Amino acid sequence: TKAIEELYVELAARRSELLRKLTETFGSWYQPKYTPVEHVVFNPSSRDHIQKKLQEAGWVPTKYTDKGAPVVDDEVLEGVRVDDPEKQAAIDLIKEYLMIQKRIGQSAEGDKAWLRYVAEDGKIHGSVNPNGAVTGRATHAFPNLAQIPGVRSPYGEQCRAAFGAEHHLDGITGKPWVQAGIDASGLELRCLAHFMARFDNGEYAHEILNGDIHTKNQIAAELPTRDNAKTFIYGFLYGAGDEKIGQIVGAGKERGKELKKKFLENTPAIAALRESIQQTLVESSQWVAGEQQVKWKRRWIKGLDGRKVHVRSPHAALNTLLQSAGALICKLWIIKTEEMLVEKGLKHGWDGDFAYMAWVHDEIQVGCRTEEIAQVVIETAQEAMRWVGDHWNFRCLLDTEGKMGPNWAICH
Amino acid sequence: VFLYHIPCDNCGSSDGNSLFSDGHTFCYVCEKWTAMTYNVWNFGESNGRYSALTARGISKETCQKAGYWIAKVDGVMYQVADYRDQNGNIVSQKVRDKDKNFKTTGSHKSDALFGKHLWNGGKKIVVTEGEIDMLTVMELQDCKYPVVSLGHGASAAKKTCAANYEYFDQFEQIILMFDMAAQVLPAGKVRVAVLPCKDANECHLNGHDREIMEQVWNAGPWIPDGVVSALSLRERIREHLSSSVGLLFSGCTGINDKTLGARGGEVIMVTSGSGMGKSTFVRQQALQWGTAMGKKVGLAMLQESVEETAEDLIGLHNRVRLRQSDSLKREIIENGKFDQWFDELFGNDTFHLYDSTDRLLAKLAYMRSGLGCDVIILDHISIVVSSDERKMIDNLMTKLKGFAKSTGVVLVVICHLKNPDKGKAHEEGRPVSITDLRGSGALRQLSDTIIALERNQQGDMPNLVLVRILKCRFTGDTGIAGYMEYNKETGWLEPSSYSG
Amino acid sequence: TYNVWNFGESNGRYSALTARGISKETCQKAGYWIAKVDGVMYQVADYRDQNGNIVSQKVRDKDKNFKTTGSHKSDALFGKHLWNGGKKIVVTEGEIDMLTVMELQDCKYPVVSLGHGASAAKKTCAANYEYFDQFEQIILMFDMDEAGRKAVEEAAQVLPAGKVRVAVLPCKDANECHLNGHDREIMEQVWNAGPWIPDGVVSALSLRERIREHLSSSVGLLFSGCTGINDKTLGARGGEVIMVTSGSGMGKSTFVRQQALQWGTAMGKKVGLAMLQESVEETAEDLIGLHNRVRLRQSDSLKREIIENGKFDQWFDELFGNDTFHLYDSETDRLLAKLAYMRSGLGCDVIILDHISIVVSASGESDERKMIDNLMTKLKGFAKSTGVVLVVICHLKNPDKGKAHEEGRPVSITDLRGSGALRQLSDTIIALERNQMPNLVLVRILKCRFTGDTGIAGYMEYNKETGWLEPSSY
DNA sequence: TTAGCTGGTCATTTTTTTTTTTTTT
RNA sequence: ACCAGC
Ligand SMILES: Cc1cn([C@H]2C[C@H](O)[C@@H](COP(=O)(O)OP(=O)(O)OP(=O)(O)O)O2)c(=O)[nH]c1=O
Ligand SMILES: Cc1cn([C@H]2C[C@H](O)[C@@H](COP(=O)(O)OP(=O)(O)OP(=O)(O)O)O2)c(=O)[nH]c1=O
Ligand SMILES: Cc1cn([C@H]2C[C@H](O)[C@@H](COP(=O)(O)OP(=O)(O)OP(=O)(O)O)O2)c(=O)[nH]c1=O
Ligand SMILES: [Mg+2]
Ligand SMILES: [Mg+2]
Ligand SMILES: [Mg+2]
Ligand SMILES: [Zn+2]
User: Closest Cα to atom 15, ligand 2: which residue?
Assistant: First the structure.
C-alpha cells in the first residue's frame, strides 16, 4: 500500500502542472450557451476541445471515422504538425496528461480502484469467473487483476512491483516468501499446427519445435519488435482486412496486401482449413448491401471435450475454433499442476508450502515458502503440461517456461 | 453502478449507451445524458451561475458538487456558499463579497459544516478552517475523498467540533489543516500536519502543492500540549551552547572570580543600610556597562527624576563632582564646554531613561521589546509595594522573574533592610545576614545573586566599603568579595589595598 | 400539540413489529400503534392514568424524534394501568423494552416503563413512591451504559429499601438480547437478580483476590548519595509524596536532579520533570556534564571544545538513547492536565514538581491558604488514583529570632512556608541543612508514615569539581 | 464487406476562622 | 468513443 501511495502522491503532482502549463498556451473562449455566452476554458481530458483547438491552429485531419468529426487518439496525435512551434511541444504534454489521468483513475481514484479493495490483512480478493466468455475464457472482475499495465507501458514496473509475493512475511519465522510464474509459449499458434496437421502432413509442427517462432518471424518480416511481430501474426491469422495489418507497421494497403500474400503463399493450408470450416458450418449466406442474411446449418462447434461452443459470426469461426481449444488445455493444466503437488506431499494454503495467487489467460502466479519448493513447482509444471498434451493426443509438443523472483515485475 | 450496454438512439451506435442501476443512461459517442436577513436566496431568483475562479484555480464541477455559486443580484458579483444537513436540504447560506460584508441568512446553527451532506462514510478526513482551502483540497484530490470544513472560524473550535462528536466518530483517522487546536475528539485518532506556508492555497499557487499531498497521506501524530521529549531539543541544546557570556563587574575583581558576572535571565538584588551608597555603585556599574561595552542600558530610577541622574552621569564620567559645586556649574555654562561632555557620552544613544504596579511592567516590556535594551536597572522597590504587603511583593517578584525569564535581560533590583531587633545598627558597622531583607521572605528565594554593601560612617575610615556576596545560585561561593575605597573628590569608588 | 389523536381520524392500525421483534398481540395488549398523518407513517404510544383513561399520546417519527401532544406529567408510566398489585415488577428504561418483556412471558408478570427514561428518573420516581408500596419485589432493568449505571445508582435512593434488585445484561438492553437469541438469560435475571451493592461500600469477605494480587507486585526504588536514607525510609513508593526542603540556595534542586539522574539511568524508569526555576534549555543541559562527571554550564572553555571535536553528539547519544526524560516548561487547572498526560499517556513513574512556591503565588487569589490546601489535596488525590512516585519541592519561612536557616539552623516541622497542611498530606519530609566547612550537608528525616525512625539520617559532601553528592564519614 | 475476447470510464452594613510581616508596651 | 490485458 505504501509503494502505491508514493506513486499516487508522485503523479498527482504532475497532472496539476500539466494543466497549469497548458491552459496558458491554449486560451479560453466564449461559447454560445441577447445571445447568451459563457467563458469556457480548455479541458484536456475532452476530445472535443483538442479537436477544436487543432482545427483553429492549422491542422487538417485527412481521416474521418465519424461522419463530421475526425478521430483523435495516440496514433494521430503523433502524426500531427502545426505552424506554431509552441503547440508542437504542447501536444506531447496533452498526451502525457491523458496517460496520467488514466493511470490515476485506474490505480487510486476510480470506483473500482486498487486502494478500495484492500482487506485488513493487506491482500486483494478479486472475483474470477471461470466461464464468462463464449469461448471458455475466464473473465476477471471486482477488480480486474488481468488489466494492470505491463512493463512496456510508462509507469508499468512501478505498478507491477506493488503486486508482489514478497510482501507476505511468514507467520512463524518472520521471513518473506518467493514467487514462481509459469507461462506457456506459442499456445494458439501451436493449436493451429495441431488442427491443420491433417492437411500439410505435419511439416509445419516441426519448425515451431525447431527454435523460437516469433523471433524468426520477426527476422522474416523485418518488424522492429517481437511484440509487433506477435501482434501482426495473430492479426493476419484471425481474418483481418487490407489496412488493419498494414497499420501495424504504419504503411499502406500495398504493404498490407504483400504481407498477406507472403504469409499466405508460405503454407497453403490456412485457406484449406478455412474452407473446411466454411463447408462444415455454413451452407448459404445471402448478401445485403448493408447487412448479411445467413441460413445456418450448425451454429455450434464441438470442442475438445464435447462442449457446444457457440459461434457469433461466420468470419470469427477460426477464432472460436482456436481460442476455445486453447483455453481448455490451460484449464486442465492448472488443475493437474496441483493434483501432482498435493499427491507429492505438500500443503496448499498460506499455512502450508505454496499458494496460487492469480490466473490470467495464459500464465500462472504461485507463491511458495522456500526456493526448493519453487524448484519443485517449476519442475512439475512441465510434467503437468506434458500430461495435458498426452491425454488428448495432440499432434504437437507442448512446452512452457518459468521464472523465479520476489515480485511480479521480474516474473512477468 | 454500471450494468450493461444498450444500443443508443440519437447517435445510432451499437454498444455506446450504458445503462445504470439508478435509472439513467449515458452514451459515450453522442455524449447525451438522459434521466441578518432570514431569507434563503432562491437559485432561480438570484441568477445563479456556476462560474470558475481563475486567480486561485477551481474547476466548474467542484462548484457544482460543493455548492459554491456566484449570484448576479444588484448588478454585483456575490459568492453564495450553501450549508446543508444530513438529509440533504438547504439550511443556511453565506453571501461573501470583495469587502467581506457577511450576510448569514437562514438558521445558522452552532455545529454547521460545509461538505457534510455528501460524505458520511470513509477512512480518512481532512478538516480545514475556511472554504477556499477546502475547495483546494477537493481540486487536488478530484472531489472524491472526504473533506469537510468549519463554518464559524478558528475561534469556535471548542464549540463546533465538540457538538459534532458522533459524526467524526465514524472515521478512522482525522487529519487537521487549521493553521500553519481542539482535543475533544477521541485520542489515538487525531493527526496534525505542517505546511511551509500560511494555508493550502498559498502552497497550491506557488508550487508546494505536492507538499500538500505528502502531508495528507503521511501526517504525523498529535503531540497534546507544550510538553516535549528529550530528543527534539537536540538542536536547541546546541543553540544555547553557541550563544551566555557574563557581563563583567567593574570597581573590584573579587566579585567576578566567584559570581561569573551577569547573564541572560538574571535578577540581581543589591542592598545595604539606609544611605550607605547603593545608588553610587549601581550608577558606576551602569556607566561601565554603557560607555565601555556598547550594551544598551535602561534605567528606571524612582527616587530622583531624570535630570538629577543625567547630571550625575555627566559629572561622573569626567572624574568630577558636578552637582556638589556651584562654581563649576557657573563655569561650564559660560564657555560652552558642556556639549563636549554631552556628545562624548550620549552620542551612540546607548542610554534610555524613565520619567516617574501593572503599567510599570508594561512600560518595561515596551522598553525591552521596542527600544532594544539589554540591561534594565530599577531602584527602591519599597515605593512600588506602597491590602497585605507580603502578597503584593510576592506577586510583584513573581511577575519580575517571569519577565526576566525567556527574554535574556539582566535585571538589577535595589532593596533596603528592616529595623534590627537588638544589637547595634547596620549603618554603624553591623555585618548583615541573609534574612535581613524587608517586605517578605520571598526576596531571597527568587533572587539569583544577592550583593550587600557595608561601611562605617562614624568609625575611623568612613570611605572603605566591604562587599558581601550572600547568595550565588550559579557557582555557590559566598562571603567577602573584596575591599573598595571611596573617593571624596572624583566620586569613583576604586579597588583598595586593605586586608581585614 | 393539538389534542389526543384518535385512531380513526389518523388511520390507526394495531400490527406487529418485524425489525424490532414484537408480535401484534403484545401491541394489541399495551396500546402501541401506528398512525398515518402528514404522509409519513408515525408511531405512537399511549399513556393512561391509574383508572384507565387516556391522558397523553407520544409520537415518534422514522428518524427518532419525540413529540408530546399535551400535558406531560411525572406520575404517568407506560404500562402501569394494566396491573394493580402483585409480587414482582420489572422496571425498564425506554418504551420498547416493556413490549419486549411482555412478549416473552404471555402477560404473567407486571411490567411498567418510565416516562422520561434515565435523564429525569429521580423526579418520576420520587412522586411515584406510593404506587410501589403495594409490591413485594422490584427488579430494575436499565441500560448497560454509563448513564444507565448512573440512573440505577441514583434512582434506588427514593425507592423503599429491601425490595430493589439490579440485573445485569450482556447486551445493551433487553431488545438486543431478544434479537440475538438470548432469551434464556433475561428470564433468569428477572427471577434471580443481583441484590443490594451500592458503589463505595466493600464487604470484607469478598476481597480475597485483590488482597492476594496486591501483595504480589509497587515496592523498592532506592535513593542515592547516602545509605541512612534507605535505612530509615526504605526508598520511594508508588502513591507517596516526598517533600524536600532547604533554605535559600542550600541545594534543594541539585539533590533532586541527582536522584533523577540515578533513577533515569540506573533503573530505567520514565522520569517527568516540571522545572519552573529555569527554562528547558538549562535543565536538560547540566545532566550531560553531570553524567560525564564535570560541570558543563560553569566553564566557558569546555563548551567551545565540545562544540568543535564533535564529542557533544556522543555525550547526547550515550545519555538520552532511550525515551526516559520528559520535560515541561511554564491558572492551576492545566498543570494537573499536563501531569495526567504524562502519567496516563506517556507512562511516567517518577514525577518531579520543582519549586511549588510559584504555582501558589502566581495565581490571583485573595486567600492563599485555601488555594494551597485545595491544590495539595487534589494533587494527593491524583497521586492516590494513578499511583505514581511524586516528588514535590517547597520552601521554608522566616524564623522569629536567632540564626538564619542558611547558616546551620536546625529546622523544625512547623517551618513549612504557606500553610499547615503541607505536612499533613505529605508522606515523607526530608530536610537538607548546611553551613556557609561549606560542604558538609546533613539530612534530617522529619516525618515518615511507613516506618517510624526520624532524626539525623547522615552526612554528605558536595564536590566543587565534578558535581556529585558523595557520602562522607565525619 | 469486417483481427478477435473481456473490463473500466460518466452525468444532474456586621461575624469566624489559618498564615506572613513589623513598630512598641 | 478512449485506454488497458492475454
Ligand atoms: C498478443 C495476442 C495474443 N493472443 C493469444 C496468443 C496466445 O495464445 C495467448 C497469449 O498470447 P501471448 O502470451 O502474449 O503470446 P505467446 O504465448 O504466443 O508467446 P510467448 O509466451 O513466447 O511470449 O493469446 C491473441 O489472441 N491476440 C493477441 O493480440
Ligand atoms: C559610597 C559612599 C557614598 N557617600 C555619599 C555619596 C552619596 O551621594 C551619599 C548618599 O547618597 P546615596 O548613595 O544616593 O544613598 P543610598 O542610595 O545608599 O540610600 P537611599 O537611596 O535609600 O536614601 O553618600 C559617602 O559619603 N561615603 C561613601 O563611602
Ligand atoms: C549544597 C551545595 C551547593 N553548592 C552550590 C551548587 C549550586 O551552584 C548552588 C546550589 O544549587 P541549587 O540546587 O541550584 O540551589 P537551591 O535549589 O538550594 O536554591 P533555590 O531555593 O533558589 O532553588 O550552590 C555548593 O557550593 N556547596 C554545597 O554544599
Ligand atoms: Mg505465453
Ligand atoms: Mg538611592
Ligand atoms: Mg533550585
Ligand atoms: Zn449516442
Answer: B275
Nearest to B140 among A5, A12, A39 (CB): A12
In three-state secondary structure terms, B453 is strand
Contact (Cβ atoms closer than 8 angstroms) between residue C339 and residue C382:
yes
Contact criterion met (CB < 8 Å) for A9 and B144: no
- Cβ of B214 within 8 Å of Cβ of A9? The answer is yes
Which residues, at least 6 apart from C317, have a Cβ–Cβ distance to it below 8 Å? none
CB contact under 8 A, B442 and C328: no
CB contact under 8 A, B225 and C316: no
Q: Any idea what the Cα angle at residue B116 is, between residues B115 and B118, rounded to 5°?
A: 80
Contact indicator for C309, B212 with CB cutoff of 8 Å? no
* Closest listed residue to residue A31, CA positions, set A23, A21, A19, A41: A41
Which grid cell sits at A408?
511480479
Q: Parallel, antiparallel, or unpaired for β C440-448 and C428-433?
A: antiparallel
Rounded Cα gap, residues A162 and A181, in angstroms:
16
Cβ contacts of C393 within 8 Å, gap of 6 or more: C243, C244, C245, C252, C253, C256, C352, C353, C354, C355, C356
- Backbone phi and psi for residue C76, each to the nearest 5 degrees, phi listed first: -115, 120
Identify which ligand lies nearest to the alpha carbon of B426.
Answer: 2
Which grid cell sits at A279? 463447408
3-state secondary structure of C59: strand
**Stated in angstroms, how far is A388 CA from E1 C1'?**
42
Q: Within 10 Å of residue A291's Cβ, how many Cβ atoms?
A: 7
What SS3 class is residue C13? strand
Parallel, antiparallel or unpaired: strands C241-245 and C389-393: parallel
Partner residue facing C248 (CB), from B236, B241, B434: B434
The Cβ of residue C322 has, within 10 Å, a number of other Cβ atoms equal to 12
Return the DSSP state at C345: I
CB C442 within 8 A of CB C469: no
C261 is written with which cell numbers? 539522574
Q: Count other Cβ atoms within 10 Å, centred on residue A307.
A: 14
List of domains in chain A: 1-122 (1.20.1060.10), 123-185+298-412 (3.30.70.370), 186-297 (1.10.150.20)
Cell matching residue A366: 504461485
Nucleotide nearest to B24 (CA to C1'): D11
- Return the H-helix or E-strand segment holding B284: helix B278-290
In sequence order, the 6+-apart residues with CB closer than 8 A to the CB of B164 are B111, B113
Residue nearest to atom 23 of ligand 2 (CA): B275
Number of H-type helices and E-type strands within chain C: 15, 16
| Residue B114 CB contacts under 8 Å (≥ 6 apart), including other chains | B66, B81, B83, B131, B134, B148, B149, B150, B151
Cβ of residue B15 lies below 7 Å from strand E: yes
Rounded to 10 degrees, the C-alpha dihedral A208/A212/A215/A219 comes to -60
Q: List, in sequence order, every beta strand (DSSP E) within A9-117.
A: 29-32, 37-40
Rounded to a whole number of angstroms, the distance between the first and last alpha carbons of chain A is 20
C93 is in an annotated binding site: yes
Cell readout for C122 is 429521580
- Cell readout for A367 is 507463491
The reply to whether A314 has its C-beta less than 7 Å from any atom of strand D is yes
Whether B94 contacts B81, CB under 8 Å: yes
Q: Name residues whose C-beta falls within 8 Å of residue A270's C-beta, 6 or more positions apart in sequence.
A: A196, A237, A264
Phi and psi of A105, rounded to 5°? -65, -25
- Give the residues across from B413 on adjacent strands: B269
- Which technique was the structure solved with, according to the deposited record? cryo-EM
Residue A85 in contact with residue A57, Cβ under 8 Å?
no
CA distance A412 to A389: 24
Closest residue in A to B145 (Cα–Cα): A109
Strand E contacted by A102 CB (< 7 A)? yes
